[PDB]
Amino acid sequence: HYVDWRMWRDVKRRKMAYEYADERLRINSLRKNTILPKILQDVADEEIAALPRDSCPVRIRNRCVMTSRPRGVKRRWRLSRIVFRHLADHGQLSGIQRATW
Amino acid sequence: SLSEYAFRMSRLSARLFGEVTRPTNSKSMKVVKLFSELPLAKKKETYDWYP
Amino acid sequence: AISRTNENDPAKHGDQHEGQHYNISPQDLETVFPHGLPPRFVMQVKTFSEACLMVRKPALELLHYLKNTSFAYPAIRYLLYGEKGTGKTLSLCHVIHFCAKQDWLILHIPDAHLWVKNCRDLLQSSYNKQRFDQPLEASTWLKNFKTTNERFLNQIKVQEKYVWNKRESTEKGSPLGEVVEQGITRVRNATDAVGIVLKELKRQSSLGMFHLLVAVDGINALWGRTTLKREDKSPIAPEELALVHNLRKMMKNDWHGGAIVSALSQTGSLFKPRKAYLPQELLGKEGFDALDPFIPILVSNYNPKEFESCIQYYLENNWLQHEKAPTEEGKKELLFLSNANPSLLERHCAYL
Amino acid sequence: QGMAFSKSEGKRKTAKAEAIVYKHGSGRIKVNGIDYQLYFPITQDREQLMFPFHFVDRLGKHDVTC
Amino acid sequence: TEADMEEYIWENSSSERNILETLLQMKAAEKNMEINKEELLGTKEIEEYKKSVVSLKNEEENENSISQYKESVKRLLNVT
Amino acid sequence: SRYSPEFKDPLIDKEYYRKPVEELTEEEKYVRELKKTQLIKAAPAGKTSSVFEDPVISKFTNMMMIGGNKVLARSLMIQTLEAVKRKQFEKYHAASAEEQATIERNPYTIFHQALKNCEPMIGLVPILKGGRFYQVPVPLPDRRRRFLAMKWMITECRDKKHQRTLMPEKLSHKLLEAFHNQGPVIKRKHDLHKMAEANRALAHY
Numbered sequence: 056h057y058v059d060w061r062m063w064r065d066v067k068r069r070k071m072a073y074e075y076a077d078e079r080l081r082i083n084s085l086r087k088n089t090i091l092p093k094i095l096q097d098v099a100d101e102e103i104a105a106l107p108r109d110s111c112p113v114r115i116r117n118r119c120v121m122t123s124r125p126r127g128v129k130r131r132w133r134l135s136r137i138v139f140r141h142l143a144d145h146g147q148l149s150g151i152q153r154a155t156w
Numbered sequence: 157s158l159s160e161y162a163f164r165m166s167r168l169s170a171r172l173f174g175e176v177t178r179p180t181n182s183k184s185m186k187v188v189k190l191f192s193e194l195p196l197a198k199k200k201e202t203y204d205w206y207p
Numbered sequence: 208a209i210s211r212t213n214e215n216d217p218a219k220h221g222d223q224h225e226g227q228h229y230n231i232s233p234q235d236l237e238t239v240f241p242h243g244l245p246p247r248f249v250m251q252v253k254t255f256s257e258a259c260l261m262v263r264k265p266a267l268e269l270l271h272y273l274k275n276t277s278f279a280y281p282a283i284r285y286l287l288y289g290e291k292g293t294g295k296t297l298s299l300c301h302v303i304h305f306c307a308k309q310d311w312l313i314l315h316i317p318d319a320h321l322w323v324k325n326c327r328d329l330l331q332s333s334y335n336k337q338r339f340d341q342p343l344e345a346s347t348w349l350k351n352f353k354t355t356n357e358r359f360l361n362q363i364k365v366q367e368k369y370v371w372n373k374r375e376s377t378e379k380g381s382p383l384g385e386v387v388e389q390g391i392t393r394v395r396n397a398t399d400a401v402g403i404v405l406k407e408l409k410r411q412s413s414l415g416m417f418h419l420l421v422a423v424d425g426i427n428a429l430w431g432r433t434t435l436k437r438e439d440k441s442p443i444a445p446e447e448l449a450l451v452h453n454l455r456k457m458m459k460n461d462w463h464g465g466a467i468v469s470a471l472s473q474t475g476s477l478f479k480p481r482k483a484y485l486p487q488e489l490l491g492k493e494g495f496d497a498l499d500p501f502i503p504i505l506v507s508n509y510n511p512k513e514f515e516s517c518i519q520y521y522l523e524n525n526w527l528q529h530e531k532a533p534t535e536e537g538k539k540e541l542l543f544l545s546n547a548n549p550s551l552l553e554r555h556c557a558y559l
Numbered sequence: 560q561g562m563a564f565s566k567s568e569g570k571r572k573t574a575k576a577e578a579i580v581y582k583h584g585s586g587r588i589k590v591n592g593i594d595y596q597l598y599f600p601i602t603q604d605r606e607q608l609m610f611p612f613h614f615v616d617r618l619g620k621h622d623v624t625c
Numbered sequence: 626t627e628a629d630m631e632e633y634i635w636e637n638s639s640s641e642r643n644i645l646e647t648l649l650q651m652k653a654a655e656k657n658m659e660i661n662k663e664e665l666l667g668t669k670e671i672e673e674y675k676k677s678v679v680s681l682k683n684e685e686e687n688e689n690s691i692s693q694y695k696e697s698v699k700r701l702l703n704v705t
Numbered sequence: 706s707r708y709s710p711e712f713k714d715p716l717i718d719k720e721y722y723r724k725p726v727e728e729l730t731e732e733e734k735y736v737r738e739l740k741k742t743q744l745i746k747a748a749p750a751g752k753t754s755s756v757f758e759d760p761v762i763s764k765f766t767n768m769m770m771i772g773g774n775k776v777l778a779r780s781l782m783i784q785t786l787e788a789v790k791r792k793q794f795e796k797y798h799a800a801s802a803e804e805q806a807t808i809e810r811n812p813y814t815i816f817h818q819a820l821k822n823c824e825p826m827i828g829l830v831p832i833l834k835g836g837r838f839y840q841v842p843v844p845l846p847d848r849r850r851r852f853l854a855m856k857w858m859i860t861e862c863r864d865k866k867h868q869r870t871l872m873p874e875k876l877s878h879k880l881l882e883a884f885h886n887q888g889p890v891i892k893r894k895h896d897l898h899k900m901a902e903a904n905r906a907l908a909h910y
């Protein structure tokens with residue numbers, strides 16, 4: 056019941072990224088220092104590379120929550136420019152108005 | 157570039173204010189940042205992005 | 208001639224001559240001032256075909272101290288300070304002219320900021336491998352030092368043996384001119400020749416041979432920062448320069464038989480803001496400690512009397528060509544725009 | 560001290576100034592505690608300060624702290 | 626060290642060392658053998674010089690402080 | 706413009722205001738009582754009541770200004786006026802008592818006369834006729850003649866023929882040349898006039 060299959064894939068990526076966040080954070084800490092032995096850091100490189108691809112947070116895309124538009128999204132409202140304007144132009148977004156100056 | 161007095165006075169303030177006490181390079185200071193905040197994936201804006 | 212005085216002897220100037228311009232003969236410009244005059248003031252000498260210096264209370268105060276100098280006590284440090292363009296350099300030159308005409312030996316550094324910046328050939332020193340030599344800066348000064356003190360460079364004789372190379376050496380008793388000619392002829396030895404000159408003059412003035420005036424304009428350069436870089440693009444410190452290391456010693460009051468008169472300058476300084484003029488702000492902590500105890504003499508803008516005589520000196524040379532400049536309405540505008548500042552007035556009058 | 564003065568304000572672009580002009584003075588102008596020629600090293604800025612006093616023939620007759 | 630201090634202290638400073646070295650050269654020039662440190666640094670002239678250097682070092686420098694320092698140096702160096 | 710049409714330009718002239726009332730005419734009396742009811746624009750930063758104000762030099766300075774850098778443009782101007790004055794003081798001291806009387810040392814008089822010697826009386830217009838272009842001579846208004854004298858002088862000094870010479874030395878040298886009816890800018894005036902004479906038969910287009 057999500058807008059499209061592409062929104063559904065991002066939903067799963069956000070769910071899997073949330074589930075692996077603690078594990079990935081801990082392994083990354085081992086890789087992000089010059090204190091531990093390289094032999095130990097080389098093993099940590101392999102461990103985080105073996106985690107599921109969709110646990111990686113860089114693959115999450117901020118899509119419009121009502122239309123799944125992948126670009127032209129305003130982060131504060133999580134809406135595409137088109138959907139935001141539709142609500143704003145009907146006076147349904149509190150405090151938002153056309154700007155003239 | 158600090159005198160012995162200044163170097164030891166800065167190391168004492170770090171102990172009192174709960175900062176890093178050992179000499180640590182910038183690369184290793186990322187460990188402190190990593191555990192001082194929530195990961196992006198754990199932020200509510202991220203995992204509750206969609207309704 | 209309401210702005211001129213007939214007294215051209217700087218030893219006879221007094222409070223009655225304040226605001227009046229005395230003439231420096233062309234012979235004294237060539238001998239006493241081969242360097243040290245402000246560049247724009249040099250332009251005025253070529254334009255007016257004469258060099259005329261106003262007698263002002265900063266120089267008169269300083270001339271009073273020098274005339275009462277006790278040559279048995281350690282040398283006294285005098286520091287001219289003031290806002291930009293107030294006349295510090297030309298007050299120093301008025302004092303250099305007094306000592307030059309009293310048969311003092313003149314050690315005049317016309318600008319010490321030139322020794323800490325824009326050095327193309329910064330060679331390593333041979334006498335000390337931890338210091339850098341400056342052949343062009345050192346040879347240039349040596350030529351001017353020879354011109355000013357040529358009559359004394361034969362009577363003064365070295366008191367040690369100085370080795371320039373394996374083959375060449377200056378034996379004891381050789382005229383000090385020989386040390387000055389080695390540095391000029393061989394620029395590689397110029398920085399070491401300067402160090403020997405400062406060494407012998409400080410030594411032989413304390414023995415009673417002659418009176419020595421140390422005149423350093425831009426003294427705040429010696430204890431500041433440099434813009435010179437090493438081959439590894441690392442900053443060099445002023446103490447590591449042989450010229451600055453040796454000049455710093457002339458500024459100590461560990462000798463007698465003369466005086467040390469210096470002037471601060473923000474113009475041409477390094478890492479100092481435009482409006483910095485006070486001694487500590489320009490000298491720093493290392494600089495103020497090196498000169499303390501010293502007698503600071505303030506140089507300020509023209510007083511009403513000095514301003515009018517300056518305008519009259521310009522009008523007497525036909526320098527103010529605008530038909531409204533001689534009027535009272537024109538002089539009030541020239542006073543507001545300069546605010547009585549000598550340098551601002553000269554620049555404004557330069558194009559009127 | 561009993562010295563008569565007036566106070567006013569001016570705006571130019573994003574600059575805002577508040578000036579105190581004393582009835583009697585010698586022509587001194589202080590800008591944020593600084594002499595006007597040290598604060599305004601550009602000759603055109605000093606001409607602008609001259610313009611009001613010169614136009615009414617009162618150069619050297621008032622002190623200003625702005 | 627001195628660089629760590631945030632308040633200037635005249636005692637055991639370069640100023641105290643320089644002025645004392647100067648006064649000794651002056652006594653030697655007069656051929657006087659009263660070279661006692663406590664006596665040289667106990668005069669009123671030294672107390673004004675000490676008060677002037679400290680003001681220059683710990684307070685904002687200005688034309689009035691430089692003039693107070695000037696008059697203190699002239700009395701110690703016998704410059705009239 | 707941020708000024709409504711009601712705003713009148715300011716008249717910056719001390720003499721205009723000190724003029725006595727009796728000398729005023731009935732027309733000049735009306736203009737003065739009218740302006741008391743009118744809105745006046747703020748005086749621009751360019752012009753003041755100063756006795757040293759010269760509108761011609763101020764205009765030449767603006768025509769030299771690059772990218773709003775008035776400080777640099779004015780610095781070049783005053784350096785040129787100083788360079789002209791020093792060149793004339795050098796020519797004056799090196800001359801005999803008789804020649805000294807003819808040597809001008811005022812740079813404002815030289816600057817004004819140098820430009821007046823470059824003003825072209827008549828100019829040409831590129832006109833099109835039958836798919837072919839032929840220039841037509843026409844009188845020049847006073848504004849255009851003064852503007853062209855300043856544009857030719859500035860253009861000549863910006864020419865790449867001058868190698869590493871600073872602007873105050875180039876302009877001072879050209880002003881003194883034109884002051885003596887010599888130079889490239891004077892030639893440009895002569896060429897424009899000579900061309901406007903060869904096209905006199907085309908004055909009917």
Ligand SMILES: Nc1ncnc2c1ncn2[C@@H]1O[C@H](COP(=O)(O)OP(=O)(O)OP(=O)(O)O)[C@@H](O)[C@H]1O
Nearest residue numbers: 245248261291292293294295296297472474549553
């Ligand atoms: N005593 C004087 N006699 C004649 N002209 C003077 C005198 N003092 C100042 N002037 C004028 O003011 C100009 C600036 O003087 P001078 O170079 O001595 O100032 P300064 O304070 O040393 O400058 P800076 O702050 O740049 O080091 C001179 O070139 C000269 O035109």
Ligand SMILES: Nc1nc2c(ncn2[C@@H]2O[C@H](COP(=O)(O)OP(=O)(O)O)[C@@H](O)[C@H]2O)c(=O)[nH]1
Nearest residue numbers: 334368369370371398399400402403406449453
């Ligand atoms: N070439 C050369 N320079 C000398 C000699 N003696 C002294 N100098 C120079 O004179 C300066 C002053 O001498 P001195 O007081 O011995 O210097 P210091 O040893 O560096 O403190 C030195 O810095 C050298 O530049 C010498 O024998 N040969």
Ligand SMILES: [Mg+2]
Nearest residue numbers: 113114115116
């Ligand atoms: Mg992305």
Ligand SMILES: [Mg+2]
Nearest residue numbers: 295296424472
């Ligand atoms: Mg100077």
